[PDB]
């Protein structure tokens, strides 16, 4: 019987700073045990300082990104070139995803940008449009490897102040763009080692009030 | 998931856990399982995260259109029945939602309606919904009285989620408390089980099964 879904592998990772946000994703595209591309970007600038990635089944991923980009365009036409706020984008994507509740888009969706107060924002969506703003989210094949590392290093989970008898927690604080990119690079090198569908290249999109900047890094190609 | 809402002298107490899972994978421990439809209306979420989130959000739109058209805040009965009539249209489609509609109105008073995705709609004084509903029921039922104080009721609601958060593998994260009065709902904070458990264990002297 015809199976309309497939798994194109890869993994994505969104981290929110104080006055910035990053959305990182490996550039490897696979089917079964074959590499399709070593550089196929799946993290996109959608305008209005929103970056988006729909990791999982690439066909559904591209279809969704395409529809959202188009949704941004028609938002400008219908509402006098008004800027689409990240919160408004998130709700719009829920409606795109849930519209196919009974024939779902097979993707884990992460968008990143700045909220209307100019602070870093990351939104993550399950395949059927359930969404939640977070400081931290890994998505895709190696999500289970990276996410507990992020819990430990970004949100400082299970870490107690030395000599306080495990009574005082390590205090939460915003990370610098330099410190965040270190965690992203170490998350992806670690994921590349222990997951076969992750590697080749890492592409990071950094969102500040100045706009969207890109950074690229090599990963192991085995 | 574990959600409970019960009716007492002081009004309605609503307690929910904050964890969402995909199989044995813990997806998140920081989920808002209570939606604030309006100042006097609360919605509880169990089952499919997307289904509950989407349709309870949609309900809030329908409740707003009611008070624009009728120049009057929607009744808890009418609000609950919009949702129960909606899911009933989708019956057999595979929607998985276990929800409680909690609110106060003048004509009704404090009211709780259980609404699930196979179309069941029940008015009642106590409901627990989720994988750890039984664990919550165990503690809640054995300690529940109508004459509980607002302070004691808030604690019992909190302690009942903690009980489920402990024993149920698929419940945990943090406890989100609400108190619904004649003046509307009041938020009583987010309580991390990480700290709350040891705080309760020490102060209460309970949880003797655990290595202290």
């Amino acid at each position: 019987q015809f199976n309309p879904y497939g798994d194109n592998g890869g993994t994505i990772l969104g981290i929110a700073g104080e006055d910035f946000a990053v959305l990182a994703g490996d550039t490897r595209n696979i089917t079964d045990y074959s590499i399709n591309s070593r550089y196929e970007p799946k993290v996109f600038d959608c305008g209005d300082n929103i970056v988006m990635s729909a990791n999982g089944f690439a066909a559904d991923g591209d279809a969704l990104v395409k529809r959202f980009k188009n949704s941004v365009k028609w938002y400008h036409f219908d509402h006098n070139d008004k800027k689409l706020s990240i919160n408004s984008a998130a709700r719009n994507i829920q409606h795109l995803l849930y519209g196919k509740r009974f024939f779902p888009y097979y993707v884990h969706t992460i968008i990143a940008g700045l909220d209307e107060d100019g602070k870093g924002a990351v939104y993550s969506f399950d395949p059927v449009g359930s969404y939640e703003r977070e400081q931290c989210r890994a998505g895709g094949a190696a999500a289970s490897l990276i996410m507990p590392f992020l819990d430990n290093q970004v949100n400082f989970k299970n870490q107690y102040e030395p000599g306080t008898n495990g009574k005082v927690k390590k205090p939460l604080k915003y990370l610098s763009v330099e410190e965040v990119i270190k965690l992203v690079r170490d998350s992806f090198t670690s994921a590349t080692e222990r997951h076969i569908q992750v590697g080749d290249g890492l592409e990071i999109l950094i969102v500040t009030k100045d706009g969207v900047r890109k950074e690229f890094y090599e990963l192991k190609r085995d | 998931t574990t959600t409970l809402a019960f009716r007492f002298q002081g009004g309605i107490i609503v307690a929910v856990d904050s964890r969402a899972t995909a199989g044995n994978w813990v997806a998140s421990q920081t989920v808002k399982k209570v939606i604030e439809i309006n100042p006097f209306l609360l919605g509880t979420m169990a089952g499919g995260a997307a289904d509950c989130q989407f349709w309870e959000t949609w309900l809030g739109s329908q409740c707003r259109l009611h008070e624009l058209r009728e120049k009057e805040r929607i009744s808890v009965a009418a609000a609950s029945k919009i949702l129960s009539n909606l899911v009933y249209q989708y019956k057999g489609a595979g929607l998985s939602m276990g929800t409680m509609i909690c609110g106060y109105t003048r004509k009704e008073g404090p009211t709780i309606y259980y609404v699930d995705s196979d179309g069941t709609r029940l008015k009642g004084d106590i409901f627990c919904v989720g994988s750890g509903q039984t664990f919550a029921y165990g503690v809640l039922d054995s300690n529940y009285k109508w004459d509980l104080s607002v302070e004691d009721a808030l604690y019992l609601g909190k302690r009942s989620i903690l009980a489920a958060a402990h024993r149920d593998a698929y419940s945990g994260g943090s406890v989100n408390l609400y108190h619904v009065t004649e003046d509307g709902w009041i938020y009583h904070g987010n309580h991390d089980v990480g700290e709350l458990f040891w705080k309760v264990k020490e102060e209460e002297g309970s949880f003797n099964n655990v290595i202290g």
């Binding site: - | 899972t21 399982k33 979420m45 499919g48 997307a50």
Partner: peptide, 4 residues
């Protein structure tokens, strides 16, 4: 998809 997730559950609660």
């Amino acid at each position: 998809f997730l559950y609660x």
